[PDB]
Structures are given as C-alpha cells and as structure tokens.
C-alpha cells in the first residue's frame, strides 16, 4: 500500500515516464505462402483473490476488488512523503528490508531531489534534512538485507552526498547502540557474523573460485558487522591477508567505505603498540601494514585518503604505526628498494645513462619503473591537502628526537639508521613521481628549507641538486650562486673558505665526474623484436651525451683548479666527511673529486 501511495510522486521525479514507452511485446511472425506475416499475441484476463498480479504463460491474473485503492490519495510533494513516512514507516520499522524495491525508490527520490537544486543557496538545508531521514528510517532497514548488493548500492549512491563525518556517525551508531537493544537487527547481525566466520575458516588457494564470490556477496550486502571478524583474522594470521586482498576485486563502493572505517577503528582501538617483552614492536602492526599496502596496490577505487590524513596527523606525536604504514606503503606500492648491499659494479651502473641505470635497477630487484601509474596515484593522494613538505620535515625532525632517547645502543643505532633510510627512500619516490613544475610547486623551495628550518646542508642538496643541474644545463641564462642565493649556510662557517669550492663540490654529482665507457660497451655487446628496437635506439647516444658532459665538467674543473692548511682543514671538516657518511654514491664521489681536482 505504501508503494502504491508513493509511485506517482516517484515517477514525477527521476523521470521514467518519457522512458515508459518501451514495455511492449514481440509480435508473432510467421511465413505463410512464402511471405512474412505479423500478428499480435492474444491473452485473456482472469480474476483471483491473490493480491499481486502475474502472468502465467498464457493469461494474466488480477485482484478482483478493483477499487481497493479508492480511499487513498498518492503524494503530491516530497513534504507529504515525510509526513506520511512518520506514520507508515515508523510502524513497518526495521522490517522495511523485506521489500527491497521501496529502498531503491526512496533513495532515487532523494538523489533527484538533491540534484534538482545543485545551484541554489539552500542546498545545505535539504542535505541536512535528508541526512536525518536516512538516519532514522532507511539505514536500519538496509542493515537487515540478505545477499542483495544492488539495494545497498542504491542507498550508498544516495549517501555519497554527505560529509564523511556524518557517514561515520551513522555507521558507528548503528554498530554500537542499534545492533544491541533491537531484536530483529540483533538477529540479523548475529546470523551474518556467524556466517562470515564460517566462511573465513574455509578459505584456501584451491577453493577461492567460489568462496571469493560468496564472500564478496556477503561483505557487500551487510558489511559493517561482517567485516570485523575478517579484520581481526587478517590482523593476526599470515595468508588470509593475501586471500582477502585478492577478493577485494568484487565489492562495491559501500563495502569500500565501511572497510576504510573499520581499518581506522582497529588502528585506533585501545591496546599496546610495543611488544610485552622489550622495545620490539608488536606482531600485528606488521601484518596490518602489509594489508594496507596490498590494498593501495591492487584495488584502485579504494580512496584511502582518510588513512593518509591519519598518517599526516599522528606523525606529529611519533606514533610507530604511522612510520610503519609509511614504510610498507613506499616499499610495496612504489617499489623503492634500499641501497644497503650493492656490489661496486651495480653501484657504478646505478648512476649513468638511462638504459644502464634501468638494467642495474632491474638487477638489484627494484621495480620502480613498472609501477609508474600507481605510484602517481598515491603521490596524488599525498598532493591534496599539501602533505609533502609537512611529511618530509616531520620525518627529518623525528629522527633527531629518536637520536635523543635513552635505551641500549644496539637498538638506538638500528632505529636511527632505519629512520634515515626511510627518509632517503621517500625522497627518491618524490623525485621519481613529481617532475617539471609540480616539483618546484609542492616541495618547499631551497632558501626557506635552509634558513627557516635549518636542515643540514647534505639533505638540502640531496633534494635540490638534480633540479638545479637541470635548470643550469639547458637554460644557460641563470648561474649557480644566484639560483641558490640568500642561503645562510648555518653550520658551514663560510669564512676562510672559497664559496666557489663549496658550491662546486656540493653542486656536482658522480654522473658528471666519471666516464667509464666500458660498461656501455659491455651492455652493447651483450645486447647484440627488431633486435630489441635496434639496441634500445642505439643506447650509445647517451654515452655521447655523457662524453660531452664529462668534457664540460673537466673544462670547468681546469679553471677552478687554477683558482685554488686552514683550508685543507675546513675542507675535510665541512665538505668531504659530511658527504662521505651519506649513501655510498656520495662516498665514491668524494673519493673521485679528491683526485682530479688538486695538484
């Protein structure tokens, strides 16, 4: 009776009347005497006592008492829909779910009503009012459904218009206060939970073909009470994590939002972070972080923005879960392997022309090149709300506070070094994904970095040397000591040292100070389809450019050496010892520049 009451209001919006003219039957066609002939199908009408119409294969049945709808008047305006919801729906109660079609109709009415006045100034009024309505009448109903994804898809298609704070309010209230203290909701939640655990006990590498579909249906229909057992089971078991990340490919946006919700729930639940024994971190942080990284890697419609706001926020207080999630995100999605163990030949190839570098990286088991698209997506998540500079400064100034703690040295050294490597790897990712003008736009330019925050000079140059070399080489208009002008260079004590030597040391690199020319030939000879695109477009063009660069740099160093114990002391003090203690390439480069630059 309610659906008949509401139908004419529903057709007036979400206009289907213009599309009503497509419910017709195929004409019976027959070939007689060698010509086509069309006829209509013939049916007859019977009257029965059953209320719902039907059509049993030749004839149509109808309810006999054809004026039962005489005493009722359909709605004329959504306001009447509210006024009569308060009577019929407050009676039907949580059982509205027994008829899915009503959910769809009311939700589409809501969507069209919100879309009708996108321009007007009073939109927030209608948004608040529909928020209250969906909170009180529809969401408890949709919590009752049984393996029926599309209805929840519709309700969420309406919910998409709210601030996410409100969606979290509704979800959490439904979880805490309305699951208990209401009977049919409690029954449905308990049934769904028991069924979810029953399925979770039977996930295998061999039975995934059907268990994945069943789990997808069950999670998509009634997520926020069937997800928590799954979240715990992957919180402390090994392979269920990979299995779940495999089966996320199937559920709709509602499951996605609820999944992100319960992830924040578990990440914020009150419990200890460090292991009971000592300073070792607990055994769930790692598996949860692996899960989150797998999510960011595989399913690309996940929208983990709020988790990244969690990171950017809770790093301020030094939460270990933030650092861990960041490490696993960088290493799994981005593909940025560290430089702890590198043979001298690989270390050499790792800074050369493009193809030699690519071969070196693929040899060191690094896959940053093949992951360009998803790395760009993640850095786009980071780009919004301008988290880049805040995160770099946070990581840096956090490692210092880690240096000033008190513990056993055997853990202090390892912690400090681990933070250092994490920062280095993050900056490698940032330089890989943000190029051109976007870099200079969202990476906090040099002089502020070095004068306001007092970063140590090696990190400053480690960020800016590539961009400075690029702006110097092509656009020969500007010159060094101008594009880096104004820097205070605080710990340097530029007295009693030629700033020419300073900037000539830190500006350069290894690629522009050493030409082997043997590795190029080795690669060219071992590479001899179209012959691999003609030896990768005659890789040797990069070697030619490399020769030109070597020649220009050596020409520079000639006049510079024509130009230049106190200096011999301060040079070691502030120029080669700080440079060597960095990653290996800085050490090799300090070695090479010690020679070929002096008498």
């Amino acid at each position: 009776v309610f659906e008949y009451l509401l139908n004419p209001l529903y057709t007036s919006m979400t206009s289907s009347g213009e599309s009503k003219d497509m419910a017709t039957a195929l004409m019976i066609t027959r070939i007689d005497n060698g010509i086509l002939a069309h006829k209509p199908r013939l049916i007859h009408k019977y009257k029965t006592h059953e209320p719902f119409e039907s059509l049993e294969l030749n004839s149509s049945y109808v309810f006999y008492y054809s004026e039962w709808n005489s005493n009722l008047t359909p709605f004329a305006s959504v306001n009447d829909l509210f006024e009569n919801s308060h009577i019929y729906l407050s009676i039907i109660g949580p059982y509205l779910g027994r008829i899915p079609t009503l959910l769809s109709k009311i939700s589409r009415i809501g969507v069209a009503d919100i879309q009708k006045n996108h321009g007007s100034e009073s939109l927030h009024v209608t948004i608040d009012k529909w928020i209250d309505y969906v909170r009180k009448f529809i969401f408890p109903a949709t919590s009752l459904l049984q393996n029926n994804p599309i209805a929840t898809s519709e309700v969420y298609e309406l919910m998409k218009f709210f601030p996410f704070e409100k969606r979290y309010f509704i979800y959490n209230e439904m979880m805490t206060k309305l699951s208990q203290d209401i009977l049919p909701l409690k029954v449905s939640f308990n049934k769904a939970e028991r069924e979810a655990k029953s399925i979770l006990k039977a996930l295998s590498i061999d039975t995934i073909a059907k268990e994945s579909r069943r789990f997808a249906k069950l999670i998509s229909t009634n997520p926020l009470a069937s997800l928590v057992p799954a979240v715990k089971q992957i919180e402390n078991y090994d392979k269920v994590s990979e299995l779940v990340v495999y089966t996320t490919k199937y559920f709709n946006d509602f499951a996605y939002d609820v999944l992100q919700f319960v992830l924040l729930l578990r990440l914020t639940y009150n419990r200890p972070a460090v292991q009971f024994d000592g300073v070792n971190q607990a055994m769930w942080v790692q598996r949860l972080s692996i899960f989150i990284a797998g999510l960011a890697k595989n399913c690309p419609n996940m929208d983990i923005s709020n988790i990244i706001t969690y990171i950017l926020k809770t790093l301020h207080n030094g939460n270990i879960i933030a650092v861990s999630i960041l490490k696993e995100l960088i290493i799994t999605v981005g593909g940025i392997r560290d430089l702890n163990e590198v043979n001298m030949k690989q270390l050499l190839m790792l800074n050369s022309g493009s193809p030699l570098k690519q071969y070196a990286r693929h040899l060191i088991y690094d896959f940053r090149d093949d992951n360009s698209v998803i790395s760009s997506r993640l850095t786009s998540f980071f780009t919004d709300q301008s988290a880049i500079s805040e995160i770099i400064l946070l990581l840096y100034t956090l490692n210092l506070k880690a240096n000033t703690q008190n513990s056993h040295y055997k853990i202090l050294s390892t912690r400090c070094d681990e933070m250092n490597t994490l920062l280095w790897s993050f900056i490698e990712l940032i330089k890989h994904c943000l190029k051109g003008k976007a870099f200079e736009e969202n990476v906090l330019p040099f002089v502020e970095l070095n004068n306001r925050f007092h970063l140590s000079t090696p990190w400053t140059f480690h960020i800016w040397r590539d961009y400075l070399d690029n702006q110097l080489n092509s656009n020969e208009n500007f010159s060094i000591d101008e594009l880096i002008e104004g820097a205070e260079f605080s710990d340097v004590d530029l007295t009693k040292i030629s700033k020419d030597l300073f900037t000539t040391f830190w500006r350069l690199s290894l690629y522009d100070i050493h030409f082997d020319k043997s590795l190029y030939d080795e690669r060219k000879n071992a590479l001899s389809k179209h012959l691999i695109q003609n030896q990768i477009k005659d890789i040797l063009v990069t070697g030619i450019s490399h020769q030109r660069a070597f020649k220009k740099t050596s020409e520079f160093i000639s006049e510079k050496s024509n130009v230049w114990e106190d200096q011999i002391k301060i040079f070691l003090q502030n120029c080669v010892v700080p440079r060597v203690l960095f990653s290996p390439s800085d050490a090799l480069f300090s070695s090479f520049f010690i020679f070929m630059a002096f008498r």
Binding site: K201, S204, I205, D206, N343, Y365
Partner: protein, 361 residues
C-alpha cells in the same frame, strides 16, 4: 645476505637471496669457505640442516662454464632425491643462464638421455644422477667425463655399503680426471665406512562421541591448519571421506597406498591448498610444516615417545601452537600418566568453556 660475507659471484648471491637464505647454519659457514678452494670434503651433519646447499654453492662458485663440457657430477641413491637435487641446482642457478643442469635416473629411455646429451641446447655442465644409469651412460660412451672437476656423492654411506652402488660409483670415479675436487656428504658415517610454547590438553570421553565432538571443535577453534592423528588407515580414510562430506576440505595420507599419491598429497597440503589433513604415525617423525597451529590426537599412541613425536609437528622451531587429545580407554590414561613423569608437563583436562584463542597464536 650472510652469503655476501662469502665473497661469491653477484648473480649467484641474488639467486641465493631469492631462495630465502639469509643466515648460514653452522655446517655451511664451517664447510663452504674451505670447499671453495677445491679441497675434498667429508661431511657428517644432522639431517635437514642444509647439507645440499654447501656443495651446491661450492660447485656454483668453482664452475667456469665450458660448452659441452661436463665437470660436475653428483651421485645419489634415489630418483626422487635426484629430482630434488636437480631442483636445488635449478633454484640455485636462476641468475646463471650459461650453466645447464640435468638429472639421470631409471625408468626413462636411454636414447632420450643420449639425445639430450648430444643437444647443444641441453648439453649439461652439471649432472645429478643415480650411479647405475650414469654407469650405463659412461660405459656406452653416451656421456664424456674426461674433464670432470667436481665429484659429489650424497648419502655416501649407503653408496659405499651396497656393492652394486659402490662398484658403479667407482666406475664413474675411474673415468674422471684424477686431479678433481671430491666431496662426500651423509648424516650417518660410522667408523667402519686427497687430504680432506606449546599448549597440551586432552579429552577423556567414549568412542561414539568422537565424530560429533571434532565436528564441534573444528567448528569453534580458530585455526590455520589442522592435523588428525589416527592409529589405523581404514578409520583415517573413513573420517576423511566423512569430513570432506562435511564441507570441510581434507586430505588423507598413510600406508597401504602407492607412493606416488602419497608424495602428491603431501606436497599439495604443504602448499596451503587445503586446510585439513589426516594421517597415521607414518608422518610421526621428520615432517616439517609451519602453518599447523592446532592438532587433534584422535587416537593416542602406545608409548610416550611416539606422542611427543606427534606433537612435534606443531610449534615448529619454538613457535606457538595448540594440541588436544582424545582419551577413550585404560591404556590411553596410562600413557597420559606416563608422559608427565618423563617430560615434566601438566596435561590438564580440556575445560568445557573453551580456551582463549590468543593463548596459542
């Protein structure tokens, strides 16, 4: 990357690193540094401590690949062990493309082995084999060992105690250059054979309630994998048929069955393909499975040592686990009483209300 302290080839280092090896055992660090120089080695160690890896890394170090030249010959006792040694050579030679490995054992046409030996695409520098088949190849000049530099004999005790095996290995040894590297490896070298956290519980009940009880336990306990110990093959196969009928994926392994299917199902369950496995005491010793977290002793054994061997399949390398046993007769309680006196362990009676799941994970 402890093997990086070994100062070996980088591609070999990557092939070891992708094999999960991170810290060498005692026997590896004690033997590989000296075997790399080409000295003969005679090794005795406890089984399963990575004795194959020693000489595998050694021969992958000392080899300089020469086309069509066989320098490395390994002789074993079985065909499946030969397959395992060639698989080890393959997982060790991932980053070595020029080197080629081959395996020789009975049951295959000798002409196919010959033609693959003549093929340049399959001309092997490393050959693992059974002594009889490789003897039949050398004596027919199907393979040339005039340039062999490395001779490995695994399980050398059985190689030298059996007369046919020692004669075959000596015929292979006399056809090799005398100035070669020689290595023998075995877990058992008697004196007679060139300058060489676990939780323990029990259920005392009657037989006719077992089938429903597990159907409850296997329903409530949170588990990765479950193993079911039985005393007979018929009861085990029946319980597996019923469990698979119970929407519970389960496998069965025991005697009275062809070895092929035993290896097949053993390997299958090792790979996390199903979550329930049932076996008699055939796997009472030697088995190594990590993910088993919950064990159900359907029928107790006769002696305490067999029960401890059973429970050893859980809590591998000092990890956490849960064990629960069935008691249905007098000798069951007898062995239950004897295990505590020998092993100093209180096997309490399993409470009805269940145990905290975190007490075993």
């Amino acid at each position: 990357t402890g093997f990086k302290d070994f100062l070996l080839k980088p591609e070999l280092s990557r092939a070891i690193i992708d094999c999960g090896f991170e810290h060498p055992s005692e026997v590896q660090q004690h033997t590989i540094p000296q075997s790399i120089h080409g000295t003969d080695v005679l090794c005795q160690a406890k089984s399963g401590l990575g004795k194959t890896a020693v000489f595998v890394l050694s021969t992958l170090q000392q080899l300089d690949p020469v086309p069509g030249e066989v320098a490395v010959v390994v002789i074993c006792n079985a065909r499946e062990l030969a397959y395992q040694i060639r698989n080890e050579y393959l997982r060790f030679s991932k980053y070595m493309p020029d080197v080629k490995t081959a395996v020789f054992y009975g049951g295959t046409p000798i002409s196919k082995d010959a033609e693959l030996l003549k093929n340049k695409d399959t001309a092997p520098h490393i050959v693992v084999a059974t002594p009889g088949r490789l003897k039949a190849l050398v004596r027919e000049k199907y393979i040339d060992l005039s340039h062999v530099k490395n001779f490995v004999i695994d399980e050398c005790d059985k190689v030298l105690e059996e007369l046919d095996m020692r004669r075959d290995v000596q015929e292979i040894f006399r056809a090799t250059p005398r100035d070669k590297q020689v290595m023998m490896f075995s877990a058992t070298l008697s004196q007679e054979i060139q300058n060489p956290g676990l939780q323990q519980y029990y259920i005392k009940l009657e037989e006719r309630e077992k089938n429903r009880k597990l159907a409850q336990l296997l329903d409530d306990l949170e588990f990765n994998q479950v193993i079911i110990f039985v005393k007979s093959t018929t009861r085990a196969n029946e319980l597996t048929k019923l469990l698979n009928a119970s929407n519970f994926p389960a496998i069965t392994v025991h005697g009275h069955m062809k070895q092929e299917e035993r290896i097949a199902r053993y390997k299958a369950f090792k790979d996390f393909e199903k979550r329930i496995c049932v076996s008699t005491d055939v796997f009472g010793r030697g088995i190594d499975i990590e993910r088993i977290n919950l064990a159900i002793n359907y029928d107790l054994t006769n002696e305490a040592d067999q029960y401890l061997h059973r429970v050893g399949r859980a809590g591998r390398f000092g990890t956490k686990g849960l064990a629960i046993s069935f008691v249905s007769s007098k000798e069951d309680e007898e062995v239950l009483a004897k295990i505590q006196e020998r092993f100093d362990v209180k096997i309490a009676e399993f409470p009805e209300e269940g145990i905290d799941p975190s007490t075993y994970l």
